[PDB]
Every structure is written in C-alpha cells, then in structure tokens.
Amino acid sequence: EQLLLLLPVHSEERRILQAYCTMATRRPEELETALHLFLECIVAAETDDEDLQLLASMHEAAAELAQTLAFALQCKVIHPEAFLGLAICLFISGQETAARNVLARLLESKDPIAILTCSEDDTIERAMLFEAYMDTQEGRLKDARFVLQQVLSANEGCSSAWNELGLIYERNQKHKNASQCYQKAWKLVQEADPDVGYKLGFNYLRGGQPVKAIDVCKRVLTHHATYPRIEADIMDAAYSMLRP
Amino acid sequence: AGFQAALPRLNELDVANSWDKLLRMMRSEYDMSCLTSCLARELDEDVAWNPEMLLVQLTSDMLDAAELQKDSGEA
Amino acid sequence: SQGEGIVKYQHTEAIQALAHNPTSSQLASVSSVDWGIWSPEQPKVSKYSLPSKGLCAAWTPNGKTLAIGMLDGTVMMLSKTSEEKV
C-alpha cells in the first residue's frame, strides 16, 4: 500500500490494485470493501506518522466508498483484471458458486489465442490457474488437467501449473511423472519455493531417495527458513530412513 | 498451509528514498509525476570534505565502476 | 586379509558401525538392539536394550572410553573400564 499510494488516483490500475491490497489482508470487512471496489471498477469500465496517517485515511476512504452484483452477471466483460479480482474476492469470502459464474463469464470471451499471446498481460493465464484451483476442490481433475496442458503448451515456464499437474498426478499415484514435472518446476523456480520443494521432498521420501529429499529441504530452509511442517514431516523421516 | 515470504523492506531497497513519504501527500488529489522526475536519488549529509581524500575517493569509485564491467572481460 | 571369514554372527535388525580399539584386539559393533562386544576369546556377547538404533562409534586412542553417536544426540561414555557415563 505504501507503493500503491505512489500511483495516480485517477488511474484504473491504482483503482483495481487498491482493491487487491485490501483483499490481501483476508479480513472479511476488507473483503467486502474490495468487492465493492471491484464492482465500482467494472461499472466505471462499462461506461513517520504521516505515512501511517495516509494509510489509515485511504483505508477509511475505501470503507466509506464501500458504505451491483447482477451488473457483473449481465454487463459486457470489458475489463478482465477487475473480473478476476472480483472472482477471487468471491472465492476467498466463501461464495464459490458466484466466483464460478463470474470467472466463466470472463473466460467465455476467448477460453487459445489469448493465452498464446506474447504479452505482459497475464490475467487470462491467472484465470486459468484459478480455474484449476477451483476444479481441484470439486473432486474432478480431468478438466483441470485440460486447462493445465493448454496453459503449459502456451507457457512452458508456468511453475504453478507444473505444481498443480504434479499434485493431481500424486492423487493419481502416478509418481514417476509427478517427480519429473516437479523437477521441471524445481528447475524453473531455481529451488526457491517452499511448497513445490515440500511436495518434491515428500515424493522423494515416498520414492525412497532420502538424500535428494534432504537436499531439497535444505534448499527450502536456506531460502525460506520459516516455512512450517518442513523438518518435522520430511527431514526427520529422511534421517530415520537414510540407512534402513 | 499459508506462508508468505520475507521480502526486503522498502527503505532497505534504497536508503535515500525519502521522497516516498513526500510523494504520498501531494498525490492525494491527482498526478503530478512530470514534476517529480527531478528529485535526486540520494541526499546530502552533514559531513566534512578533505580535498585530497575526496579526490582519492572519487578516483577509486570511478576505477571500481570501470572494473565492475571489466570483470566480465567483454571488449 | 586374504578373504577368509572369521565368524558370521547375526544381529537383531540392522548394524550401523564397527569400531576397533587401537590397543586391544577386539572390536565393538553398533547395531539396532545395542552395541555388541565381540571378542576373539569370548564368542558370548551380552544383549541389552537401547532407545533406538545408533549411528556411529569412536574409541579412545588409549582405549579408555567408547563414544556412541546417536541421531537424537545422546553421546554416552559407555566404557568397560569405568561404568560412569557422561
């Protein structure tokens, strides 16, 4: 938010990123303020105590501007990033069905040419990632794999997509290709992510290669030492089953 | 479970970026960014300058600036 | 040295370390159940319980004390000469 106050007030990017910063806090009242901010964004698109003081004042301004849901459902999907922000606000706040509706409305535009774009804008790709996340909670995975294969054919560096396909492989017990794509993800990440490192170490543990698991967990800790559940779930068993 | 990486503080990225404070008041109404392309990156401190030591420091800094690129060996 | 086995004696589940005293001929094996003391004169080895399986072992150059390296960190001065443990 300290950086966000550097943005022009009239800029659309500031207006949507303000809602993003408010929804980041995960606070339900902040979620409501962000939701109303995003609804205002889509409607408008259709047609050192001083720094803390500024932070507080912008928080109050968002609160009072928060004091239109059918407008999202019915209007033309002209502003995609605001649609994505609204959808993730709906998902975090708890309403999964409305998030499904709004994001399906966003991605019925192109569903592909849009992903194959060599552009800085990646809102469409992030929408694909969110759709994979939502489908992973539905009990079905075939359409999630469909989306992941699409985005990875378009974008080979999508480390999160590799992570998700590895995870659904782990559900399918297909562990060799899961480990292969996890190694792909680990290479792309440059060994600097706690979650793909965590699951890679767990796969090594299940694969019975505790030296590799120790290497992965040591990289996780030398980069993100505060990640929980890493040592007590991987390192202890790797030490225990290093020499059976 | 949720985990958020520890990223550097804004003042860690630059020590003399106090304009971050100043620019956060004027922008309360609209954008004046064409006036703010003039603020110096650093700021002067309260020190004393010996002529010979200052010249030696300037020469050493320019030599280090040259040698930082010269370490790659590109020519 | 030539390749003739002297004796082939089993342990309970697994063996971890082998330590030879530079002074005396007999060695000490570190295994799953406990550390066994096999000697050429006495094939009988006493068996006792340990919290878990050890990792490493080290004898003193004069043969005073034996140190057992353990995963949980318990290094015990279990020496036959002195029953005291540090």
- DSSP assignments along A93-127, one per residue: HT-HHHHHHHHHHHHTTT--TTTT--SS--HHHHH
CB C14 within 8 A of CB C32: yes
**Is A244 in contact with C16 (Cβ distance < 8 A)?**
no
- The closest of A238, A167, A229 to A206, measured between CA atoms, is A238
DSSP single-letter state for residue C75: -
Q: Tell me the C-alpha distance between C80 and A52, whole Å.
A: 69
- CB-count exposure of residue A42 (10 Å: 0-12, 13-18, 19+): buried
- Other beta carbons within 10 angstroms of residue A158's beta carbon come to 21
Q: Tell me the C-alpha distance between C84 and C65, whole Å.
A: 10
Count of CA atoms in the C-beta half-sphere (13 A) of A209: 12
DSSP single-letter state for residue A231: I
B contacts of A9 (beta carbons < 8 Å):
27-31
Q: Tell me the C-alpha distance between A105 and A80, whole Å.
A: 10
Q: Tell me the C-alpha distance between A5 and B20, whole Å.
A: 9
Pair of tokens at residue A97? 């069905």
CB A38 within 8 A of CB A85: yes
- CB-count exposure of residue A11 (10 Å: 0-12, 13-18, 19+): exposed
Q: Tell me the C-alpha distance between A184 and A179, whole Å.
A: 9
- DSSP assignments along B5-61, one per residue: --PPPHHHH-TT-THHHHHHHHTTTS--TTTSTTS-SS---S----HHHHHHHHHHH
User: What is the gyration radius of the CA atoms in chain A, in angstroms?
Assistant: 21
Helix (H) or strand (E) holding C66: strand C66-69
- Other beta carbons within 10 angstroms of residue A59's beta carbon come to 16
Touch of B by A (3+ CB pairs closer than 8 Å): yes
**Is A243 in contact with C16 (Cβ distance < 8 A)?**
yes
Which of residues 14 through 33 in chain C touch A, CB cutoff 8 A?
14, 16
**Is A240 in contact with C16 (Cβ distance < 8 A)?**
no
Nearest to A6 among B6, B27, B30 (CB): B27
Pair of tokens at residue A161? 């997509």
Residue whose structure tokens are 């996340």? A133
CB A184 within 8 A of CB A157: no
C contacts of A241 (beta carbons < 8 Å):
none
B contacts of A226 (beta carbons < 8 Å):
3, 6
Q: Tell me the C-alpha distance between A163 and A184, whole Å.
A: 9
Size of interface A-C (CB pairs under 8 A): 5
Q: Tell me the C-alpha distance between C57 and C37, whole Å.
A: 12
